[PDB]
Amino acid sequence: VQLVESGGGLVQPGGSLRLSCAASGFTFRNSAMHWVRQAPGKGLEWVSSIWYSGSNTYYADSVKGRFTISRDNSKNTLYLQMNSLIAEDTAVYYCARFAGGWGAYDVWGQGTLVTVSSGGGGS
């Protein structure tokens, strides 16, 4: 049982990234899948949720209209399409299997770092 994120990296404000989470060792289509992020030196913040297909989706207020979660069950893969990135989005992004009554966030990937930075100037 395992998740493996990928697709992170350094980008400048206004750019876009698409993260990937590759699931294995469980029946992917029967799990709700979430993204949870952690700004450097900060707490966990839930970002987004998708159900079995579902297609019902849920987003934190801070990423509404910029991020889009989706899944491809045939590929055992969860995705986060990150548009209009801003500095505040900087964080390790974790994908997690949400097991609800059967375990909350019982499975986490290793996380993928997204850094949004102009490099200090143009402030």
Binding site: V36, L44, Y94, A99, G101, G103, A104, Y105, D106, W108, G109, Q110, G111
Partner: peptide, 14 residues
């Protein structure tokens, strides 16, 4: 490291 589940449903140990 990534977070690790300890407890769910208030009192259920993982």
């Amino acid at each position: 490291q990534a977070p690790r589940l300890l407890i769910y449903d208030s009192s259920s140990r993982a």
